[PDB]
């Protein structure tokens, strides 16, 4: 391998670029946004860009992060100087800009270029990409594709019986930028992850009545699964049932690459991408990886060792099965999540001992148990404290220990 | 059999009460709007109003009638004398109201009274409305209820693969308004009815790419049916792709009575009510009877024979075959409806037999075979000319013949 193609320039593109750079491949990196940093990137637009792209991220203002800045940053790239640990998004845009600048990356990286297709090309990689600045296709050729362009863009729905009966106003997590569009409405929020809880805290402070629907402030009421929707009422499996005006969808988003041919050998269902090795090898063309596949971790470790281990792969050095072996392995794992009911890319029951496993596969410098530790002590206080979590503030001390300042 | 429930005032529900109190019965019409006249009122409203129940109405800005006044018109109540056959749709809703005060049946409606729940008791029937002045409940007892609640409000949306990929704009003709949000946009209209056909038009002078997707002015691009859509992509069955931002489904309307429970005896499909005897009579529960179920035929006739067939129904002056007859004919009706490939409730095909069936069993006056001639003619017009055809006018001679001006 000598010439390596990453797609995407969010936290999973740029990591996989510093450790590609770092091992003196020639390195391209395609983004199709106008700032590095991925879903950091606020911007106005939802959907469709005037540009004639997609629009990939889904970040919505006034958001703050739910882990703390010392578990974000990478273990020898510490955060710059901010008093707070849950740090608004903006710091966390800078901070991967300021990688970005540190590690000398920014002459790698072509902005406003959106990955149209990928194909193999004898034993290459053929990358058709638009420059949307001059709306010109331009084509590259690679030995190596790294895929790191995202999964929290491409919406899931849940099939509710008699939605298409429902004739208020309906909108995805996706597209939600701010509460205003919801001020004095009545408003069903379904799905209570990080969007649902965190939606249903801003809606809270502008809407009629919030309410959040799972299979806080006085104004969000809890309802269980919504199992029926007519012309403007949602019904319960619980038996109740509330006139709703608008219906907010946080049940999450699906896998989706637009760009890859059938021949690259990947099948992409809504929750499962197949066949990867640890989440990252295409098993049938193995100079095709992905980083940023998996998801529900300390993110900062796994797009550090993820960009490592995908780099030792290409450079040659990492200690793999065979194929055989490696879809025997992809099976059990798989079966395994299945028994634990989890998505087939969640790492979060085993997370550590995954973590481990790259380490010594890529040979990757150990990361400090600190974050081990901190993540597992702090990982699920937007759970716990939803309200006051982010008024915590926290100071490592070395590498296996830290505190809670105040 | 004294009192009787009709549920609607637009064209349907004031020609039922018209017959209906002509024939002695105590008639008391519910109605949602602050106007009667049904589709005919046009409303900035789409969806859900803001009196808190659905907007029934889909009529859209600077709409003219696709059928010349003339035979709009019942044959005993001729339009009033304004210039021009194809009038802009303000005369038809004076028409109406013109109609609804000729024959004094303006106190017998109730409006702003929307209709939540119908439901047998014994031989007759509760009905429970709300009226939307006061928000209070109401409930009304009755020997027979005639339906007439129309079937252009609720959308009938095509299954197309890969739509929920698509990242453009999706709008259903139901709340078409004007072709303003379309400006300087790529439109795919799916559908080409009378709305594809008239939204293609009205959508042409804002945007120079229309394309209209079916199973015209310049910049009106004819396509075949569209069979699957990605991220900004419209797919059709040639194997050509156009990109678009904006897709108009005129894909037509589905039935919806959400005000029947399931006691009532009927089954509501998206193309079918049933067991109904020649789209009126609900054969489980024959103190009902339904309006404008049927379609694709001259309205005017079709209105105002079913209500006098209704009338001879429930003051006994026509008998019907037993039950298990008018299932029998039900049944071989439906199976020709198959064989001839239309929708189970469309007449277009056997109308005028339909019609003299009507008029024998009903007790009606003979129609003037004029309408027929003329409406067998303008449809002739309408294998013409979109552009065009509006600039023709009619008048009728007599009961035979018509003539027409350039
Ligand atoms: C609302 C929200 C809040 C979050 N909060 C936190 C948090 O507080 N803490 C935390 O640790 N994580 C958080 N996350 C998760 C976090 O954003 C992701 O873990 C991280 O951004 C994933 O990085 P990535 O590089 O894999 O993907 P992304 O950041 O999504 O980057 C993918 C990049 O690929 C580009 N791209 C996509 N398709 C193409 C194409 N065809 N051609 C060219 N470019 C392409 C996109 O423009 C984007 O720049 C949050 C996520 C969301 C949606
Ligand atoms: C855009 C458009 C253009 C058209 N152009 C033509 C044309 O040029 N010529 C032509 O002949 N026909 C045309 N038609 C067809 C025409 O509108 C219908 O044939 C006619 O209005 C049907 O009459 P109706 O009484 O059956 O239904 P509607 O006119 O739809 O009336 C039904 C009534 O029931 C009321 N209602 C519904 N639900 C409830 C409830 N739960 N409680 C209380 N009230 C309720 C509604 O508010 C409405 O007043 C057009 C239709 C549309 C949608
Ligand atoms: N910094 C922040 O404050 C913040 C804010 C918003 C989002 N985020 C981040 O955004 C990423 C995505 O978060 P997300 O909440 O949008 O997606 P998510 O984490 O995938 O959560 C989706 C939730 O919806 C549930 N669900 C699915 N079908 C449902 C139904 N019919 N009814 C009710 N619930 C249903 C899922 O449950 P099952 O899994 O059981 O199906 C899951 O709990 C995460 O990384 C999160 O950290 C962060
Ligand atoms: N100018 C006017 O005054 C005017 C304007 C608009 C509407 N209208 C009236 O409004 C009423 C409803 O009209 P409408 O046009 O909305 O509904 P419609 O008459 O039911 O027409 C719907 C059309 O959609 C087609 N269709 C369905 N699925 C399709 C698909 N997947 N791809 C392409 N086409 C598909 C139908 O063909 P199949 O039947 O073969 O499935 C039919 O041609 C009619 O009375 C009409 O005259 C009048
Ligand atoms: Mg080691």
């Known amino acids: 391998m000598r010439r390596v193609a990453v797609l995407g320039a969010g936290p999973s593109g740029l990591t996989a670029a510093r450790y590609l750079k770092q091992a003196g491949f020639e390195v391209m990196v395609f ?11 606020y911007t106005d637009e939802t959907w469709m860009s005037e540009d004639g792209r997609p629009v990939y991220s889904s970040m919505y203002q006034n958001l703050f992060v739910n882990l703390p800045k010392e578990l974000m940053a990478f273990p020898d790239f510490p955060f710059h100087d901010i008093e707070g640990s849950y740090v608004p998004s903006k710091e966390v845009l800078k901070y991967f800009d300021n990688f970005t600048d540190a590690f000398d990356l920014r002459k790698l990286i072509k902005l406003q270029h959106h990955v149209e297709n990928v194909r193999p090309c004898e034993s290459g990689w053929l990358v058709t990409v638009t420059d949307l600045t001059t ?15 995202g999964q929290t863009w491409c919406p899931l729905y849940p099939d509710v019986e008699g939605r298409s009966f429902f004739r208020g106003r309906l909108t995805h997590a996706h597209e939600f930028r701010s509460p205003e569009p919801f001020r004095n409405k009545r408003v069903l929020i379904v799905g209570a992850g990080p969007s649902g809880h965190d939606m249903a805290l801003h809606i809270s402070y ?10 806080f402030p006085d104004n969000v009421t809890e309802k269980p699964l919504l199992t029926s929707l007519s012309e403007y009422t949602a019904h319960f499996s619980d038996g109740t049932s509330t006139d709703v005006d608008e219906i907010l969808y946080c049940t999450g988003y699906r896998y989706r690459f637009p760009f890859l041919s059938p021949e690259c050998g990947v099948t992409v269902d809504e929750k499962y991408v197949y066949p990867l090795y640890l989440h ?26 993820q960009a490592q281990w995908v780099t030792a792969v290409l ?11 490696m879809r025997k392995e992809e099976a059990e794992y798989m079966e395994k999540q299945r028994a634990e009911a989890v998505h087939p ?9 995954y973590f481990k496993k790259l380490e010594e596969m ?15 002590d702090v990982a699920s206080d937007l759970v716990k404290d939803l309200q006051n979590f982010r008024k915590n503030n926290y ?12």
């Open 31 to 41: 983004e199709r946004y106008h700032h590095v940093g991925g879903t950091w990137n």
């Open 135 to 149: 709306m010109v296709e331009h084509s590259f050729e690679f030995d190596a594709v790294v895929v790191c362009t």
């Open 206 to 215: 502008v809407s009629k009545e919030v309410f959040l629907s799972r299979k």
């Open 280 to 305: 990252m090898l295409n098993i049938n063309k193995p100079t095709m990886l992905f980083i940023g596949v998996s998801y529900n971790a300390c993110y900062s470790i796994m797009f550090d060792l």
């Open 315 to 325: 450079a040659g050095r990492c200690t793999l099965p065979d194929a055989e072996t």
């Open 345 to 353: 890319h969640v790492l979060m029951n085993h997370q550590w001992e």
């Open 362 to 376: 890529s040979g990757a410098k150990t990361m400090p148990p600190v974050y081990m530790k901190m993540f597992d």
């Open 395 to 406: 100071m490592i001390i070395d590498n296996e220990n830290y505190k809670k300042i105040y």
